[PDB]
CSV table of C-alpha atoms in Angstrom, one decimal:
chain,number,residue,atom,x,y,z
Z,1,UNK,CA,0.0,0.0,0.0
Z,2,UNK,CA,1.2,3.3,-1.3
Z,3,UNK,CA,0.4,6.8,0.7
Z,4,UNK,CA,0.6,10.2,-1.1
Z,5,UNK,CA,2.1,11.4,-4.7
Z,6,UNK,CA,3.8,14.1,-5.9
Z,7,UNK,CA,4.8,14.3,-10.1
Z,8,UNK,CA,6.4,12.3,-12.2
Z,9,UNK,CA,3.0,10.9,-13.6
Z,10,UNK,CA,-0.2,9.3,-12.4
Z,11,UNK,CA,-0.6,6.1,-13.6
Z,12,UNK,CA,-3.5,3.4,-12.3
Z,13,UNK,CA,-4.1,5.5,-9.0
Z,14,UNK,CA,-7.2,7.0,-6.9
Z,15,UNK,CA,-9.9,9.0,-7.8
Z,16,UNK,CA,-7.4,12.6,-6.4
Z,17,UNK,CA,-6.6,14.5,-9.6
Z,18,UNK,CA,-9.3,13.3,-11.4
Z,19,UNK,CA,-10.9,16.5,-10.5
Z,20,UNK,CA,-8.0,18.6,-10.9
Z,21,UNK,CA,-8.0,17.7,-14.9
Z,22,UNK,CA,-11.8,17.8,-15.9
Z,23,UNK,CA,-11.3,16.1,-18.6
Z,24,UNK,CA,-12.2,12.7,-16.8
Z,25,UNK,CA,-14.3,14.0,-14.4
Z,26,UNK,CA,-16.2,16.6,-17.1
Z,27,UNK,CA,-16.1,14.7,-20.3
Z,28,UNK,CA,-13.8,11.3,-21.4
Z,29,UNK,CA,-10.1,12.7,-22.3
Z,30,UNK,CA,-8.5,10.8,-20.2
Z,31,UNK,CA,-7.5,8.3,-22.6
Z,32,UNK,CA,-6.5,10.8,-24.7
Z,33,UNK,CA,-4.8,12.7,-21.8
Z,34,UNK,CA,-1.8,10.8,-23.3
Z,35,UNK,CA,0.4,13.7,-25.5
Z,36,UNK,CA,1.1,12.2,-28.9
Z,37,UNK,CA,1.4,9.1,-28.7
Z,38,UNK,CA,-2.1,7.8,-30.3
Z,39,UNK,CA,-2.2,8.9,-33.9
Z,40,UNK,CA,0.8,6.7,-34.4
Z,41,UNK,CA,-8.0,3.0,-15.8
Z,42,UNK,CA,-5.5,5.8,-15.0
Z,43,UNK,CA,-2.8,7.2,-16.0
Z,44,UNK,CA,-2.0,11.1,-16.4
Z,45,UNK,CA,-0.1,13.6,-18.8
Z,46,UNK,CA,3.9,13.8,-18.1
Z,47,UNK,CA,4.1,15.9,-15.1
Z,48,UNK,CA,1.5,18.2,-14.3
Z,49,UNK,CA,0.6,18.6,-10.7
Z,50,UNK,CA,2.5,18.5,-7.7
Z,51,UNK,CA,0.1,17.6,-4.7
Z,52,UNK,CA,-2.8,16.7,-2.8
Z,53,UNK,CA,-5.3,19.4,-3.4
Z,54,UNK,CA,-8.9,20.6,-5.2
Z,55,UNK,CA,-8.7,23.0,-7.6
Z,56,UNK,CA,-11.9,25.1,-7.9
Z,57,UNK,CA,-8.8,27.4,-7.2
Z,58,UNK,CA,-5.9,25.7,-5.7
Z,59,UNK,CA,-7.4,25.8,-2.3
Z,60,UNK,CA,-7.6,22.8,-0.5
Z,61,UNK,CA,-3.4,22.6,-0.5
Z,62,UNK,CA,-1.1,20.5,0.9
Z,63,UNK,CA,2.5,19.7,-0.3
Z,64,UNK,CA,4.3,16.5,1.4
Z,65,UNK,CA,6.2,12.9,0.9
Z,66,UNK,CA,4.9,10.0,-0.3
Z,67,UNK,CA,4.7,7.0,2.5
Z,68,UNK,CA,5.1,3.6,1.5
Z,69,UNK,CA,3.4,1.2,3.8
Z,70,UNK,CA,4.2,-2.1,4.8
Z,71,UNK,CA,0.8,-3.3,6.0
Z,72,UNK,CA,1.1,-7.3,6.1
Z,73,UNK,CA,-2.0,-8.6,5.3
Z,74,UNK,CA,-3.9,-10.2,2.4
Z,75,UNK,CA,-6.0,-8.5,-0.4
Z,76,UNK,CA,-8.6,-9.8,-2.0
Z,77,UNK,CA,-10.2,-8.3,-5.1
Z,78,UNK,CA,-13.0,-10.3,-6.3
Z,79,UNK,CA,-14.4,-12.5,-3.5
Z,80,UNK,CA,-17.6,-14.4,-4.1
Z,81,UNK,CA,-20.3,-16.2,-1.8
Z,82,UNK,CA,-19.5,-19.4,0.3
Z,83,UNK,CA,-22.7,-19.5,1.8
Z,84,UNK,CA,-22.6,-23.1,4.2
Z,85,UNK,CA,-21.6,-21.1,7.3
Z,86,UNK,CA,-22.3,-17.5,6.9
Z,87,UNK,CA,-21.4,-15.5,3.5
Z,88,UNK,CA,-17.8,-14.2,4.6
Z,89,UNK,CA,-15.6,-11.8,2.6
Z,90,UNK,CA,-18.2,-10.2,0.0
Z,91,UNK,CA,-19.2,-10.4,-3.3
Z,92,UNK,CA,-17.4,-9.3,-6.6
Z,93,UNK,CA,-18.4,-5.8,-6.2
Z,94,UNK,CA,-22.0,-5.6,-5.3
Z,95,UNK,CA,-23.0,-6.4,-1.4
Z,96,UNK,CA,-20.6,-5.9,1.4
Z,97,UNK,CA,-21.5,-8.6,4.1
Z,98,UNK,CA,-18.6,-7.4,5.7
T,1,UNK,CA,6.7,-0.1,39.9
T,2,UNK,CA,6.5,3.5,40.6
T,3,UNK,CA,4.0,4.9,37.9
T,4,UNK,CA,4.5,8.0,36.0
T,5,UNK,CA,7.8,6.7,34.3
T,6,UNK,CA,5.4,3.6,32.9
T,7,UNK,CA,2.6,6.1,31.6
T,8,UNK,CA,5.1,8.4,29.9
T,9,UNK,CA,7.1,5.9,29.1
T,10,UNK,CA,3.5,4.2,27.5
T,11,UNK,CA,3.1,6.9,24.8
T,12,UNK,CA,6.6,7.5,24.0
T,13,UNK,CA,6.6,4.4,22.8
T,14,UNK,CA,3.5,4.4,20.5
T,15,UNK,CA,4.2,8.1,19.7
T,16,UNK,CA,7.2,6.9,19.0
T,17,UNK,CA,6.3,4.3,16.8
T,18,UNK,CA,3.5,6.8,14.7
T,19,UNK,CA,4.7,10.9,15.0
T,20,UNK,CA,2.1,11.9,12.6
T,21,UNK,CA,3.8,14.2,9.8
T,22,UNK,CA,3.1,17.8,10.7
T,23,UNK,CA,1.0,18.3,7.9
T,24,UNK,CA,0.3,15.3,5.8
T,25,UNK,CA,-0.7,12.7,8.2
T,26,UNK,CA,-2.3,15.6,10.5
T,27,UNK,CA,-4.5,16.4,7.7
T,28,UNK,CA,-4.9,13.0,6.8
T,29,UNK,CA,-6.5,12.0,10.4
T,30,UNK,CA,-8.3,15.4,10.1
T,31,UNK,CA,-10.1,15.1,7.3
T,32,UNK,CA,-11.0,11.9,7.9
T,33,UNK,CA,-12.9,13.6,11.0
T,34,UNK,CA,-15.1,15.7,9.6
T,35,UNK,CA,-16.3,13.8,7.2
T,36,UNK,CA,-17.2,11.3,10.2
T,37,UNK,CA,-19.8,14.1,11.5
T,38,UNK,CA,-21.0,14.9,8.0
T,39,UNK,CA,-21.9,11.6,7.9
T,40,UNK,CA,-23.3,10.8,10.7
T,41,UNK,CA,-25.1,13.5,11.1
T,42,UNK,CA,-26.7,12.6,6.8
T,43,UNK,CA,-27.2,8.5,8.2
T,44,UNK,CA,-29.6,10.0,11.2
T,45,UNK,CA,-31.2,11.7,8.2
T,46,UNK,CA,-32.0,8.7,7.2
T,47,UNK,CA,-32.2,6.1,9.7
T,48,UNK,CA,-34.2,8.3,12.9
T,49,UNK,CA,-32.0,6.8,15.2
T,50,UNK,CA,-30.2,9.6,16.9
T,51,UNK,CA,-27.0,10.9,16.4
T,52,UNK,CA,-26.3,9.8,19.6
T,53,UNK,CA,-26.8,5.9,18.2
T,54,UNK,CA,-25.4,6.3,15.1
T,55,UNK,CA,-22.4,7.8,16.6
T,56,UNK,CA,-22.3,5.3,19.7
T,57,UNK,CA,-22.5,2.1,17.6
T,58,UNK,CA,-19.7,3.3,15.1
T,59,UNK,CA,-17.7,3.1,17.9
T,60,UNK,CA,-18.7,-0.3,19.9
T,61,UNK,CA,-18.1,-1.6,16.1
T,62,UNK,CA,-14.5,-0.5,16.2
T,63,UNK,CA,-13.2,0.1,19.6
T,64,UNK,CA,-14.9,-2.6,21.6
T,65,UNK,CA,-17.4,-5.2,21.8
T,66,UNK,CA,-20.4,-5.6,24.4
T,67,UNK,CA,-18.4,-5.5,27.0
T,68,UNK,CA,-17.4,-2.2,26.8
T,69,UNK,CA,-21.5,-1.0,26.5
T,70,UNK,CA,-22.2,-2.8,29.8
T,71,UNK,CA,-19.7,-2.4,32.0
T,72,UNK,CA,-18.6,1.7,31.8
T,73,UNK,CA,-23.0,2.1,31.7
T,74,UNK,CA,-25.2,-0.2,32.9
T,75,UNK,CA,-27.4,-2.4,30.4
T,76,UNK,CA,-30.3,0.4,28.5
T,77,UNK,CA,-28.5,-1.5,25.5
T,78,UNK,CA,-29.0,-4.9,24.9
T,79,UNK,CA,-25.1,-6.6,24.1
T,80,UNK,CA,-26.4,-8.1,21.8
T,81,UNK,CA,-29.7,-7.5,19.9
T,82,UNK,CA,-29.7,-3.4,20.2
T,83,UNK,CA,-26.3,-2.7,18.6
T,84,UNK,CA,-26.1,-5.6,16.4
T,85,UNK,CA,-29.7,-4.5,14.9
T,86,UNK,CA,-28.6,-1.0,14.9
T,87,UNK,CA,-25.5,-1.9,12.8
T,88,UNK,CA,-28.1,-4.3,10.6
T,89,UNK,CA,-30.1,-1.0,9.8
T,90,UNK,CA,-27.1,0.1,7.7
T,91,UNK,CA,-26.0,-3.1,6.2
T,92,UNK,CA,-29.6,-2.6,5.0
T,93,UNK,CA,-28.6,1.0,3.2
T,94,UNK,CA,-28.3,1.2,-0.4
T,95,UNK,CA,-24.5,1.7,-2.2
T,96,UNK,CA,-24.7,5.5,-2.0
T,97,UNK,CA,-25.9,5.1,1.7
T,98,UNK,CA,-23.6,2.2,3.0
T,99,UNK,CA,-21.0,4.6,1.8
T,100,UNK,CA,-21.1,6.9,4.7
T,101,UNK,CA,-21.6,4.1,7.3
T,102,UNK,CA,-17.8,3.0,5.8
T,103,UNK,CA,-16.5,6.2,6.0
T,104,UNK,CA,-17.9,6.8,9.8
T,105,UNK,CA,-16.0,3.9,10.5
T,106,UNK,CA,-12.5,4.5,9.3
T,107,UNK,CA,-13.3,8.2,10.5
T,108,UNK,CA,-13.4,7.3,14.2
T,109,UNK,CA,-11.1,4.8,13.6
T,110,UNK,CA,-8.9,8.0,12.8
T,111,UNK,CA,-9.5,10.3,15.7
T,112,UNK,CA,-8.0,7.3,17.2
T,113,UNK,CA,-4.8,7.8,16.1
T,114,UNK,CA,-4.3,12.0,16.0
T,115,UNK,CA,-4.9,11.7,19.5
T,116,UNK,CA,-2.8,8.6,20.7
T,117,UNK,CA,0.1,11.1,18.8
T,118,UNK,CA,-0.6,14.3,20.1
T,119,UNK,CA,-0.3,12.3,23.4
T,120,UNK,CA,3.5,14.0,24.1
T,121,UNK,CA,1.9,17.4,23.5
T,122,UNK,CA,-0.1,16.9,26.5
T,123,UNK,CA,2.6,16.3,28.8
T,124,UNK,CA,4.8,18.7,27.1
T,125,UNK,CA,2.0,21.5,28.4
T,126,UNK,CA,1.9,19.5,31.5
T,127,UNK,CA,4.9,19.8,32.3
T,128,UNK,CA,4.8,23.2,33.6
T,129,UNK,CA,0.8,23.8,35.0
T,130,UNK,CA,2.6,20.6,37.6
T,131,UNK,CA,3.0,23.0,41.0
T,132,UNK,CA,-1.0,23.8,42.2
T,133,UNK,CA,-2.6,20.6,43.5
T,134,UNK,CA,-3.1,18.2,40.8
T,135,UNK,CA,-0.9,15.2,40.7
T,136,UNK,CA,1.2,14.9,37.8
T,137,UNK,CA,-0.8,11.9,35.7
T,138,UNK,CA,-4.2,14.0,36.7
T,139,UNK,CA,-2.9,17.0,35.3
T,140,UNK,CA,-2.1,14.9,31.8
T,141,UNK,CA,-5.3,13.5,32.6
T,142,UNK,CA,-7.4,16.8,32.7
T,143,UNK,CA,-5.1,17.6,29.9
T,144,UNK,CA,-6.3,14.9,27.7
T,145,UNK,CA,-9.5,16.3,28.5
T,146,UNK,CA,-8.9,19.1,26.2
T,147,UNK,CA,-7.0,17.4,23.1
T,148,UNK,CA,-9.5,15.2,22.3
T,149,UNK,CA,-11.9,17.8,22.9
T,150,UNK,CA,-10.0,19.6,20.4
T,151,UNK,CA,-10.6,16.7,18.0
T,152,UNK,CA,-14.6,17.7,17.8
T,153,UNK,CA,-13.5,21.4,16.9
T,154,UNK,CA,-10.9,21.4,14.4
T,155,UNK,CA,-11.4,23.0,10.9
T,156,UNK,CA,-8.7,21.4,8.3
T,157,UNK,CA,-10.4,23.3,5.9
T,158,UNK,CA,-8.8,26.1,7.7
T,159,UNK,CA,-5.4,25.5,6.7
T,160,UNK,CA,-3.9,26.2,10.3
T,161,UNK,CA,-1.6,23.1,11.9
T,162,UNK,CA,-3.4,21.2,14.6
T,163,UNK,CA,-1.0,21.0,17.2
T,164,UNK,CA,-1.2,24.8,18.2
T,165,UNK,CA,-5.1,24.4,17.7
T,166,UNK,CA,-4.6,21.5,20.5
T,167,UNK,CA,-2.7,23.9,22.8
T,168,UNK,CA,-5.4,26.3,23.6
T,169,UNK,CA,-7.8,23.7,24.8
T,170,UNK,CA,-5.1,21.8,26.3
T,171,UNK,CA,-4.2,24.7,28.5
T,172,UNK,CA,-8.1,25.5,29.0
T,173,UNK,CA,-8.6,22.2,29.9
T,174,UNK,CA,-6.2,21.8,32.7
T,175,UNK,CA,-7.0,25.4,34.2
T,176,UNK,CA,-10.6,24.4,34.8
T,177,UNK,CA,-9.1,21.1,36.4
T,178,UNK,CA,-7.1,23.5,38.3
T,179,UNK,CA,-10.1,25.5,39.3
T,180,UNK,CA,-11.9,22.1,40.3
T,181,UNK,CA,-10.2,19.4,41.8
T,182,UNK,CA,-7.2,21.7,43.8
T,183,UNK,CA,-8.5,22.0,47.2
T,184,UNK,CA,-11.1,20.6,49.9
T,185,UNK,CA,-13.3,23.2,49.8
T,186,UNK,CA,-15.0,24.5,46.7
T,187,UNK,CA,-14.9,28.5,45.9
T,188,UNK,CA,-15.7,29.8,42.6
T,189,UNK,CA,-14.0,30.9,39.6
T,190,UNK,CA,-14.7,34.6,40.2
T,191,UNK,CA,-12.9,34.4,43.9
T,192,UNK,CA,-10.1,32.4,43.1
T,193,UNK,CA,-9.1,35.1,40.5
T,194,UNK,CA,-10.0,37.8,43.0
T,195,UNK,CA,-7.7,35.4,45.5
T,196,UNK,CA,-4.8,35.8,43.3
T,197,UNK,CA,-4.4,39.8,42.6
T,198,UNK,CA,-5.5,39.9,46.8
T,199,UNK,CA,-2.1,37.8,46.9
T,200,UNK,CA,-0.3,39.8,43.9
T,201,UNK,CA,-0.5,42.9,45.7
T,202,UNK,CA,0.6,41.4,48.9
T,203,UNK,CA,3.9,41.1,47.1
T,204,UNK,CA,5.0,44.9,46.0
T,205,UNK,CA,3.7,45.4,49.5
T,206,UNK,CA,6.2,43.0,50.8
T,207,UNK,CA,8.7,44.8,48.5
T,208,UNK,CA,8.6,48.6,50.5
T,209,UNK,CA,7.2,49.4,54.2
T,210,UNK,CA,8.5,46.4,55.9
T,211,UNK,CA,5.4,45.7,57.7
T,212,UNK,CA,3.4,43.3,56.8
T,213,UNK,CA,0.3,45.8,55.3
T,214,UNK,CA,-2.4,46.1,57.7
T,215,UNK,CA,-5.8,45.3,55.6
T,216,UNK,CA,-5.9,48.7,55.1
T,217,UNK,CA,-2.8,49.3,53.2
T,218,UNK,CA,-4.1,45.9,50.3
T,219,UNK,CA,-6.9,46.9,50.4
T,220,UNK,CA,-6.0,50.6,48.8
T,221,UNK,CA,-3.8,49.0,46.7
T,222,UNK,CA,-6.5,46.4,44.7
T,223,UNK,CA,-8.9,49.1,44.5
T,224,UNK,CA,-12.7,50.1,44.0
T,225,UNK,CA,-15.0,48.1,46.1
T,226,UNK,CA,-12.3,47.0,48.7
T,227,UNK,CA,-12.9,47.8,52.2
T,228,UNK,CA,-10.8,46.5,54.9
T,229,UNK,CA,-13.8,43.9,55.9
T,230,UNK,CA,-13.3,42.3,53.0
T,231,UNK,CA,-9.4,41.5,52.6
T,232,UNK,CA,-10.1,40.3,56.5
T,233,UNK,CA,-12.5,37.9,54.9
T,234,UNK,CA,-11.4,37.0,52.1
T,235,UNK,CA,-8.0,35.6,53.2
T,236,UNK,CA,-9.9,33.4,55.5
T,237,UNK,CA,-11.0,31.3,53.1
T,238,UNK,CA,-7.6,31.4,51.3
T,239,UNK,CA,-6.0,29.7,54.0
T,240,UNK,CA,-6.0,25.9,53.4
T,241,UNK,CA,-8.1,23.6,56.5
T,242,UNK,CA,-6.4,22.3,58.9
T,243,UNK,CA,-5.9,18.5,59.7
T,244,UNK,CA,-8.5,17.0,62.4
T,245,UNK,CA,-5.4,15.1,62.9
T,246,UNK,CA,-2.2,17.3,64.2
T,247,UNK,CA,0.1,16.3,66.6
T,248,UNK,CA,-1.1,19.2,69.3
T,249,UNK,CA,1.5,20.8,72.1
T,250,UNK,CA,4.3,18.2,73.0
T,251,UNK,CA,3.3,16.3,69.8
T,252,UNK,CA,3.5,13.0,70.9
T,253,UNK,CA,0.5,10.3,70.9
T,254,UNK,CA,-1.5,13.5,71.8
T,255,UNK,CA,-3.7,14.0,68.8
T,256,UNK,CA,-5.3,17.6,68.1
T,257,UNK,CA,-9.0,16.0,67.6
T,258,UNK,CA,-9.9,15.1,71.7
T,259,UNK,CA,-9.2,18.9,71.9
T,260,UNK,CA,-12.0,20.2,70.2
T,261,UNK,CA,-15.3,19.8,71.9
T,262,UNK,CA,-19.2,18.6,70.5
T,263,UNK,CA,-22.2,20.0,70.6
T,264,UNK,CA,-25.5,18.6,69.0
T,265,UNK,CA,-25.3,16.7,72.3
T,266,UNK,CA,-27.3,17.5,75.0
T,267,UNK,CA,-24.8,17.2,77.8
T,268,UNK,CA,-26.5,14.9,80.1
T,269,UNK,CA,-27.4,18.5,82.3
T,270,UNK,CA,-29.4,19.3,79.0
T,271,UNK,CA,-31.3,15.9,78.4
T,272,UNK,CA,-31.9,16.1,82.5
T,273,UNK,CA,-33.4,18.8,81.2
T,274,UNK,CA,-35.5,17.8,78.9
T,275,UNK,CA,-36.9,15.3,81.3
T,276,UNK,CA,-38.5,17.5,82.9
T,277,UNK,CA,-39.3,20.6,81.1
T,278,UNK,CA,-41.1,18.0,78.7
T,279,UNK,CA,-43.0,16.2,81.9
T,280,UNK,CA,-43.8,19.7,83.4
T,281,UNK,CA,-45.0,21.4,80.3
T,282,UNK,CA,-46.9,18.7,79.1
T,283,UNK,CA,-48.3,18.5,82.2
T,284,UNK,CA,-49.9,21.9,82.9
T,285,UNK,CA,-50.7,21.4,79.2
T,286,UNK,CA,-53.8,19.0,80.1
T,287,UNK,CA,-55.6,22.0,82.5
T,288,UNK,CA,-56.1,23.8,79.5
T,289,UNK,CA,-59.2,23.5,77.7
T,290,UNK,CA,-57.6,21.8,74.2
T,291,UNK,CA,-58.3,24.0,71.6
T,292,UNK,CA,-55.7,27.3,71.6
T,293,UNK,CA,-53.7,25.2,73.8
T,294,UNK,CA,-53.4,22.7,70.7
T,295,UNK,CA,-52.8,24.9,67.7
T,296,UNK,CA,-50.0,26.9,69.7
T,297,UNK,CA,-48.9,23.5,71.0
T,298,UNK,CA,-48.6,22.0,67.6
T,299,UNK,CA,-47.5,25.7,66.0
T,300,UNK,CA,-45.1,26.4,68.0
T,301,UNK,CA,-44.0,22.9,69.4
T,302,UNK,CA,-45.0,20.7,66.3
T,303,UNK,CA,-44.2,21.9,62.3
T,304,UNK,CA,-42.5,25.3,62.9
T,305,UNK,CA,-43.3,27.9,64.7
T,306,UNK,CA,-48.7,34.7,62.4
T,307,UNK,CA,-51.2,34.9,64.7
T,308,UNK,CA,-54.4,34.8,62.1
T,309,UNK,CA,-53.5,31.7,60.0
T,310,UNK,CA,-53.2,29.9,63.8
T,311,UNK,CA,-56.4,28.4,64.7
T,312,UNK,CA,-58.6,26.6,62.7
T,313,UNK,CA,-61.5,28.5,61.4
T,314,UNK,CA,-62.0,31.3,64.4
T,315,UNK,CA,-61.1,34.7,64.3
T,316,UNK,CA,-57.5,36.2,65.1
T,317,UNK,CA,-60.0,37.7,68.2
T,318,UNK,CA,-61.2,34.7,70.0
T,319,UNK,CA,-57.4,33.4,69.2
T,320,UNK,CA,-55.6,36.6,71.3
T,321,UNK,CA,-58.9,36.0,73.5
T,322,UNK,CA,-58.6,32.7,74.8
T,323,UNK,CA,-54.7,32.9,74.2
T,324,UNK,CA,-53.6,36.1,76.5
T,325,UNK,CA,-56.0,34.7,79.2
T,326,UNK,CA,-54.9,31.3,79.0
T,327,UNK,CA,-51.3,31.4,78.4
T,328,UNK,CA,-51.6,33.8,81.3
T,329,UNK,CA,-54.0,31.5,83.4
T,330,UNK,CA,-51.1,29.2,82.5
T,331,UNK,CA,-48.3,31.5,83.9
T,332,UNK,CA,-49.6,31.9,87.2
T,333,UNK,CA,-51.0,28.5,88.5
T,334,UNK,CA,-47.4,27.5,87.8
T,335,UNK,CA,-45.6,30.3,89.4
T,336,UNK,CA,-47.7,29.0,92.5
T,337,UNK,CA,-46.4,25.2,92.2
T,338,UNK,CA,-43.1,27.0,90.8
T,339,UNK,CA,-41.8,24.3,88.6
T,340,UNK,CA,-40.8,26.1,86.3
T,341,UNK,CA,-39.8,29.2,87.7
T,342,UNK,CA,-35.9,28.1,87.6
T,343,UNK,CA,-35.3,28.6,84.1
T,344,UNK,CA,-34.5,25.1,83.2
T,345,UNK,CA,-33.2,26.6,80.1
């Protein structure tokens, strides 16, 4: 598990800057947020941001590392239903009996 | 072992295992405060149950089981059917719903941590409000009492650091605890103060004349409404009390309490007394003729003892009437048989 980001790129991350460039949260540009490479899910343009923020206006600011977080445990993405004792874990994506 | 170096030495060990970063992790924990209360505060929009409910079972769900609802309060909530059903209510929520309950959760879950951190601020503060009359743990104690009541306050959205938000409470926290638990006997806020510039001034009096000011001299001194009565009486009650127990003149096994006497007692020349004063009294009270007698015997002697609302339903007349001339009638068959001339009393 990965805390905060800075720039370099944002690739396959969290719903944060998907504000910050409307054009994912707006419209559907975000697979053509990608530069040039197309005439010849996330990822982001090469550098364009720097921190954890909204940006109605750059208010909501906050400029700091970038933790990375050994938490042993064991991550499940799709889980379905066992249901002899009673339905542990959850579902694919739907219910949460948890 | 001896304490203290334990319960410092507690949180200096969590603390530090988790300093949270002076911003990042700060704002972390904080906004993922607020967001507790907005939620909450939308789920009883929705489920009835009061605030109070949804914000008490978000905890029992995290922090402890059952046993933690019927031990530190007695048993209004079932251990198991009333949280359990509570918790089932919004299980029961829709996606967009269940999504606050999860967010309440993890909330809590981090006021949890911003506090367990901020745990060496408190003692930092601490270590200074230590000289009044609250031991050292109770003044952390007290002083906890204002961090995590600075957890409820807190504006991230306001871009100021928490930890001098913290302070201010902290500090008000412990001065209250000050105000409260630092003596036997209870005074108010408003003396206490006005006990501390009456002791202030003592001191630049100290500094000149050489006498110790006579409660004329403070009382010029403080100011307005000060008259030398008051300083008189209101160092009185500055002075601490005084043990019950004291080793008294050639302190030995000679303990101070034999030395002051009691009183609610009728020494035995007082229930002597009573004896018969009550056997007299009562006595010339049956060659009366029962009415006056009785409502002055009962108003007087019996409730508490308004010469109209006395007797029943006669007049205040026939009351003074057959009162003067009785009483009277009393007082002199009993001078004759004087028993109680000699003022037993």
């Amino acid at each position: 598990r990965v805390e905060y980001v800075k720039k370099e790129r944002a690739g396959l991350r969290l719903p944060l800057a998907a504000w910050v460039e409307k054009e994912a949260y707006k419209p559907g540009e975000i697979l053509a947020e990608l530069p040039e490479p197309y005439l010849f899910g996330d990822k982001i343009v090469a550098a364009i941001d720097p921190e954890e923020e909204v940006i109605a206006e750059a208010e909501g600011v906050v400029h700091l590392h970038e933790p990375a977080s050994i938490l042993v445990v064991k991550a499940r993405v799709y889980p379905f239903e066992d249901d002899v004792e009673v339905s542990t874990g959850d579902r694919v994506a739907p219910g949460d009996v948890l | 072992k001896i304490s203290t170096s334990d319960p410092v030495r507690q949180y200096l060990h969590e603390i530090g295992q988790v300093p949270l970063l002076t911003l990042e992790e700060e704002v972390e924990l904080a906004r993922k405060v607020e967001e507790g209360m907005e939620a909450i505060k939308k789920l009883s929009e929705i489920t009835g149950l009061d605030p109070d409910l949804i914000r008490e079972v978000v905890r029992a769900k995290i922090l402890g089981s059952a046993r933690v609802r019927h031990i530190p309060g007695l048993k209004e909530t079932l251990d198991p059917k009333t949280v359990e059903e509570i918790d089932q209510k919004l299980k029961s929520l829709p996606k967009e719903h269940k999504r606050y309950l999860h967010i309440a959760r993890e909330g809590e879950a981090a006021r949890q941590h911003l506090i367990e951190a901020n745990l060496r601020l408190v003692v930092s503060i601490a270590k200074k409000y230590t000289g009044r009359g609250l031991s050292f743990l109770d003044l952390i104690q007290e002083g906890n009492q204002g961090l995590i009541r600075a957890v409820e306050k807190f504006e991230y959205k306001r871009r100021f650091k928490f930890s001098t938000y913290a302070t201010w409470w902290i500090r008000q926290a412990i001065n209250r605890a000050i105000a409260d638990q630092a003596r036997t006997i209870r005074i108010p806020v408003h003396m206490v103060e006005t006990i501390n510039k009456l002791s202030r001034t003592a001191r630049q009096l100290q500094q000149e004349l050489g006498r110790e000011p006579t409660y004329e001299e403070i009382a010029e001194a403080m100011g307005p409404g000060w008259d030398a009565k008051r300083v008189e009486e209101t160092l009185k009650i500055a002075q601490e009390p005084v043990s019950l127990e004291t080793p008294i003149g050639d302190e030995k096994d000679s303990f101070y309490g034999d030395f002051i006497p009691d009183e609610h007692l009728p020494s035995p020349v007082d229930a002597a007394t009573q004896s018969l004063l009550s056997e007299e009294l009562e006595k010339a009270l049956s060659k009366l003729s029962e009415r006056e007698a009785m409502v002055l015997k009962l108003r007087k002697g019996l409730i508490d003892g308004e010469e109209v609302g006395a007797f029943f339903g006669v007049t205040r007349e026939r009351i003074r009437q057959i009162e003067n001339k009785a009483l009277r009638k009393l007082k002199y068959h009993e001078s004759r048989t004087r028993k109680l001339r000699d003022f037993l009393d």
